[PDB]
Amino acid sequence: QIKGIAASDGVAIAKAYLLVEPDLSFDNESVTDTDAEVAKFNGALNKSKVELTKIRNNAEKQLGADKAAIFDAHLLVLEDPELIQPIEDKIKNESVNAAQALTDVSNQFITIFESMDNEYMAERAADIRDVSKRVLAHILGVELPNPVVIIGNDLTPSDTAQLNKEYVQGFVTNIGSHSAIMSRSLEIPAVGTKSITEEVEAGDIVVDDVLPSDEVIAEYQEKRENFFKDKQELQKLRDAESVTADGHHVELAANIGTPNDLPGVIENGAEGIGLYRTEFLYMGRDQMPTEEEQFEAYKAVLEAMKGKRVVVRTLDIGGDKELPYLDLPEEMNPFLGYRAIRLCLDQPEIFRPQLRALLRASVFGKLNIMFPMVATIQEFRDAKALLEEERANLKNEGYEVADDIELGIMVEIPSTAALADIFAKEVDFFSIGTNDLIQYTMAADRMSERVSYLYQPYNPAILRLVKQVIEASHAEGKWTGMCGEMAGDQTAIPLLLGLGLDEFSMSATSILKARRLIRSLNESEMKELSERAVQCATSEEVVDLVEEYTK
Amino acid sequence: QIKGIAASDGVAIAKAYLLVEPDLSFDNESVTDTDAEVAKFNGALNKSKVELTKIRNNAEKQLGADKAAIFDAHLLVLEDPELIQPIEDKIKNESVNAAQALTDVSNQFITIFESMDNEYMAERAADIRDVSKRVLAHILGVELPNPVVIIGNDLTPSDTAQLNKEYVQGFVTNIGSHSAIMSRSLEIPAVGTKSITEEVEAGDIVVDDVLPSDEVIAEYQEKRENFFKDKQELQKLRDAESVTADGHHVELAANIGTPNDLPGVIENGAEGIGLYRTEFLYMGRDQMPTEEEQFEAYKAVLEAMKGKRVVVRTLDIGGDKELPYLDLPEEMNPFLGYRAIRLCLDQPEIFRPQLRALLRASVFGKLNIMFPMVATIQEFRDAKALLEEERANLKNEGYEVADDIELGIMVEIPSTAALADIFAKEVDFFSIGTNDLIQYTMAADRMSERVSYLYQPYNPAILRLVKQVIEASHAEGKWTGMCGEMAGDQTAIPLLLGLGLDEFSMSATSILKARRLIRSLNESEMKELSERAVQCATSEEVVDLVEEYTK
């Protein structure tokens, strides 16, 4: 029973392996029948060759290709006549046994090859030493490791590969890395010991380190069908609908910041993209991104989502970021200054390329465009007018532009929530960016440590502003989404459901667990939780109410 | 008709003065009756002395005291025998007239005294030259200036004082200072000319520069009874109530930042102090202010207001300010960080001295304590608990502490407005600090130029948050005040009245004009203006509605 119960999964229950290198010690004896001694050596030699030729071929046809070149090198050594002949001649002319004959001759090679200090000649001496050990073991009749719950002294980042990952089930508990690496990589169990070298015999274990009992072999056995159970039923929801137990439907979209995030979107079952952050196109470069370059990236995503909603956020950046082209002064409170839509409306030369590209990409999918940092109705109107201006420009140039592009704002500035009903008439949708709404509403820097205690996503104040935005959009027949981390928060989800949020958008690695929660919930019950939640005074009271309705 | 119609008031209509130095040129003649010529000189000498002795005495008994020492010096010169005798001897022995005799002898003195380069010997030569000119004028029979609408070539910061400020009514239009200074200082009119030296004769003007017409002398005459009319009826409201034409009562308090602001509070008719900023006690020093020092300053004001409400704001400061004692890190967005109540609750060693002093000072007047930057209900509760803790401490030490000290928060963080109804139960009052509420609600730095266009006090969003705070306090039987510049804004006042704000607090120099506006208004009509105002979409629409209801 050791520790280090991490690095990988749990519950293994298999045999063993013990990669401990056997005792290949021998006494330098003298032989009577040298011919027999030479045949003995030649027999171990060939046995080693068929062994290697089996290891090689059975490494490529599994999971090697490039891992199968060390064995061909191992094999090349054994074909070297300048190695074999000296051994045989020693057996004959010196009348010593094969074991020492092999060792003596191979040692000389090891000696000469390491004193060359070449990165390869030291590799050669390493191959000789490695294969010489194989023949020698055959020569002495000692069965050595080769391709169960593996267990070894150290952590070989080369030895742990020979075995077939298939039968290589269970775990691999050593004693402290090269072990904890493939531990989680092979998706197996682990459980960094020390005195594990004296556990069970060669027969044997149970990862989770228990080894055996034959009694409590049922507890962990079903505890395994509890680990795979969750992971399986979870991924099974990949295509399942996002519906509450009582039939209430919601959409679970993903937040991405690059077309490279697309694979994670599909493998998690997102129902669309609620936030396509576009800063990656502008940050880390010396020139602004061209219309054509942005077009390609918007179109790629629109098309890849096959008609699913894709909400692109126009440039949301300010002076606190590098940006060599463009000259943004220092600023005392950048989060309260010249940034996002303020910068874009003030510098249309950086905004037009983005709007033209979006407009052009709109024909390849279901595109929604949202503006960040809008504080006033006139700012939305100016942005929209500029979008319409380039719309007309694109048509007079022959380009096709989708006519039903929904325009919204990302609610983050409190004044925007205070006027929800007014914006709800001119806008097509709202998307609550709680990361910044919490910040501005609590007047606490989302990145500051000294005041992080005021960054309260569950505070009644936040819930109330979220509610008036949602209710304001529904009254005008529109919808409201959320792309702030809150939307993927297990504690917030129950509340958002009750409040009536239409679409939740989050990192792809959260949709599944979120879909699970949403299914095991009653909207009628969540609605009640939210009505009381917005009547609380503190965040703690809100939390207590959520742990209550989600017992 | 010149220009420069500023520097002072308007509408004068008086005589003239023309301080132009007369022509004191004379021809060096020869005299027959030297005795008569000496008596002539002696006659001008004595006439000058009684003239000066009159100027001296009639300078102290008016507005001089320290201005009456130049004349005694002027007089001391004329008593100097080393000056007189040489003149007389010249008249007798050289047989030349007094004019040249005086000039010649005085010149020598001027010569000798200026070549000494002393700051005083040059002052002596200046006195001689100045008084020598007086005798000489008498000697030639030339009436010179002495103590109407003054007019002169230059701007003498010494000549313009001889005349009695009483008869010195009207203005003083020169040609370009030493003129524009006392222009507004004497509260007279002005109207920086150039070719004004050739205006009206010695008889004569009308400041406002018209001079005379005897026809349009009625227009400006009543236009004067329009200037003094406003200024008079305005100060008459010093003791008048702050009531709307239809009987709605409100309080007009003052905002101060030091006991030295007290005189302006009384002379403007403030009905109390709505904001006593306490930063002055902490800024610009190397040690924190002691309890005793703060006590003295709070008590002084409490007592001086004779039972009128005095709302003290606890320390409202953050890292963006010097503050040598205390160590506040750099911070990227200080307005969104460690400051005000956040700093005080985190460093009670700086907060307790302030609360103890306030508690102690409470027995000398009607004190209200309000906390700044409160964002959460728990922050108010923690501040209150700490106040109660020192309350108990002070009583167990023998100090007296008023039991009815009202506790409130300065609403500036949006979350605070979103939860108005909750705070309205635990707090005694609210005081809207619109300077920062506008900033956080519009997410625009109150001090930043590039985004000042978003600092919109009349934006519907701001009006709505103000309204929900006021309505929330009234429902709990409490009151709401406002100390942001908005409360003293002529455009905002009509709206605040309609919204039902109980107390307006502003710089003392605004209460009068504000009281005027409030009186010439119908609350029932203002209430209607506000209901529509909170239904607008833009600031411009709000403004248009105010110019409409205040035609």
DSSP per-residue letters across A370-397: EESS--SHHHHHHHHHHHHHHHHHHHTT
Q: How far is CA A500 from CA A389, A466, A480, A536, B52, in A?
A: 35, 10, 9, 18, 93
Identity at A500, one-letter amino acid code: G
How big is the CA angle at B427 (ends A411 and B370), to the nearest 5 degrees? 90
Distance from CA of A462 to the nearest CA of B (A): 7
Alpha helices by DSSP H, listed for A95-120, are 98-114
- Compute the half-sphere exposure of residue B297: CA atoms within 13 Å on the CB side of its CA: 20
Q: Would you call A419 and B461 a contact, using CB atoms and an 8 Å cutoff?
A: yes
Q: Which residues of A touch B448 (CB under 8 A)?
A: 331-333, 336-338
Nearest to B151 by CA among B252, B19, B51: B19
CA-to-CA distance for B423 and B299, rounded, in angstroms? 29
Alpha helices by DSSP H, listed for B64-170, are 70-78, 81-94, 98-114, 121-140
User: Residue A83 is part of a domain; what is its CATH number?
Assistant: 1.10.274.10
Q: Which residues of B touch A412 (CB under 8 A)?
A: 443
Identity at A523, one-letter amino acid code: E
C-alpha torsion sign, points B534, B538, B539, B543: negative
Residues B430 and B469 in one domain: yes
Specify the resolution in Å: 2.5
Residues B545 and B478 in one domain: yes
Q: How many domains does chain A have?
A: 3
Which of A416, A426, A437, A441 to probe by mutation at the B interface, max B CB count within 10 Å?
A441
Q: Exposed e or buried b for every residue in B134-143, given b needs 16+ CB within 10 A?
A: bbbbbbbeee
Does B345 contact chain A (CB < 8 Å)? no
Residues A187 and A116 in one domain: no
Q: How far is CA A172 from CA A67, A164, A166, A186, A210, in A?
A: 20, 14, 14, 11, 13
Residues A241 and A114 in one domain: no
Q: Would you call B415 and A333 a contact, using CB atoms and an 8 Å cutoff?
A: no
Phi-psi region of B254 (alpha: psi -120 to 50; beta: other; left: phi over 0): beta
CA-to-CA distance for A303 and A272, rounded, in angstroms? 12
Does B213 contact chain A (CB < 8 Å)? no
Last residue of a domain, one of A93, A111, A146: A146
Q: Would you call A419 and B537 a contact, using CB atoms and an 8 Å cutoff?
A: yes
Q: Which residues of A touch B416 (CB under 8 A)?
A: 461
Strand partners, A480: A430
Q: Would you call A418 and B439 a contact, using CB atoms and an 8 Å cutoff?
A: no
Neighbours of B215 (CB within 10 A): 7
Residues A261 and A179 in one domain: no
Q: Would you call A377 and B422 a contact, using CB atoms and an 8 Å cutoff?
A: no
The answer on whether A436 is annotated among ligand-binding residues is: yes
Facing B334 at nearest CB: one of A333, A375, A539: A333
Residues B368 and B397 in one domain: yes
Phi, psi of B169 (to 5 degrees): -75, -160
Residues B226 and B305 in one domain: yes
CA-to-CA distance for B526 and A157, rounded, in angstroms? 81
Does B465 contact chain A (CB < 8 Å)? yes
Residues whose CB is less than 8 angstroms from the CB of residue B472 and which lie 6 or more positions away in sequence, other chains included: B420, B421, B423, B424, B430
Facing A375 at nearest CB: one of B414, B442, B450: B442
Q: How was this structure determined?
A: X-ray
* Burial of A70 (C-beta count, 10 Å sphere; 0-12/13-18/19+): buried
Distance from CA of A420 to the nearest CA of B (A): 9
CA-to-CA distance for B177 and B7, rounded, in angstroms? 10
Last residue of a domain, one of B113, B146, B179: B146
Residues B339 and B248 in one domain: yes
Strand partners, A407: A369
Residue of A178, A248, A249, A474 marked active site:
A178
Residues in the annotated binding site of B for Mg(2+): 412, 436
Nearest to B300 by CA among B263, B268, B267, B255: B263
Strand partners, A381: none
Last residue of a domain, one of A116, A146, A176: A146
Q: Exposed e or buried b for every residue in B289-318, given b needs 16+ CB within 10 A?
A: bebeebbebbbbbbebbeebbbbbbbbbbb
Chain A with chain B: Cβ pairs closer than 8 A: 158
Facing A418 at nearest CB: one of B376, B450, B465: B465
* Burial of B228 (C-beta count, 10 Å sphere; 0-12/13-18/19+): exposed
Q: Which residues of B are catalytic?
A: 178, 483
C-alpha torsion sign, points B390, B392, B398, B400: positive
Distance from CA of A464 to the nearest CA of B (A): 7
Does B542 contact chain A (CB < 8 Å)? no
- Catalytic residue list contains A483: yes
In which domain, by residue range, is B312 found?
212-551
Q: What is the four-CA torsion angle of B342, B344, B347, B348, rounded to 10 degrees?
A: -140
Residues B406 and B525 in one domain: yes
- Give residues preceding each break in chain A, C–N over 2.5 A: 147, 176, 191, 204, 208, 211
Tokens of A273: 């993209």
Element (H, E) at A408: strand A406-411
Residues whose CB is less than 8 angstroms from the CB of residue A383 and which lie 6 or more positions away in sequence, other chains included: A314, A341, A344, A345, A371, A374
Facing B454 at nearest CB: one of A332, A376, A418: A376
Contact B529, B494 (CB under 8 A): yes
Residue of A74, A138, A344, A483 marked active site:
A483
Phi, psi of B131 (to 5 degrees): -85, -30
Distance from CA of A415 to the nearest CA of B (A): 5
Contact A406, A387 (CB under 8 A): no
Residues B114 and B151 in one domain: no
Contact B245, B521 (CB under 8 A): yes
Residues A415 and A524 in one domain: yes
User: Residue B404 is part of a domain; what is its CATH number?
Assistant: 3.20.20.60
Q: Would you call B413 and A443 a contact, using CB atoms and an 8 Å cutoff?
A: yes
Nearest to A110 by CA among A100, A98, A123: A123
Contact B208, B220 (CB under 8 A): yes
User: Residue B154 is part of a domain; what is its CATH number?
Assistant: 3.50.30.10
Residues in the annotated binding site of B for substrate: 277, 313, 446
| Residues 347-406 in A contacting B (C-alpha not used; CB under 8 Å) | 373, 375-378
DSSP structural state of residue B162:
S
Facing A415 at nearest CB: one of B329, B418, B441: B441
Which of B331, B336, B374, B421 to probe by mutation at the A interface, max A CB count within 10 Å?
B336
Distance from CA of A409 to the nearest CA of B (A): 15
Measured between its terminal Cα atoms, the distance across chain A in Å is 35
Neighbours of A278 (CB within 10 A): 24
Element (H, E) at A406: strand A406-411
Facing B448 at nearest CB: one of A337, A414, A443: A337
Q: How far is CA B339 from CA B291, B336, B356, B435, in A?
A: 21, 8, 20, 16
Q: How far is CA A353 from CA A340, A390, B340, in A?
A: 15, 9, 44
Residues whose CB is less than 8 angstroms from the CB of residue A73 and which lie 6 or more positions away in sequence, other chains included: A127
Residues A32 and A4 in one domain: no
> DSSP letters along A216-236, please?
TTTHHHHHHTTHHHHHHHHHG
Neighbours of B46 (CB within 10 A): 13
Q: Would you call A333 and B338 a contact, using CB atoms and an 8 Å cutoff?
A: no
Does B415 contact chain A (CB < 8 Å)? yes
Q: Would you call A456 and B337 a contact, using CB atoms and an 8 Å cutoff?
A: no
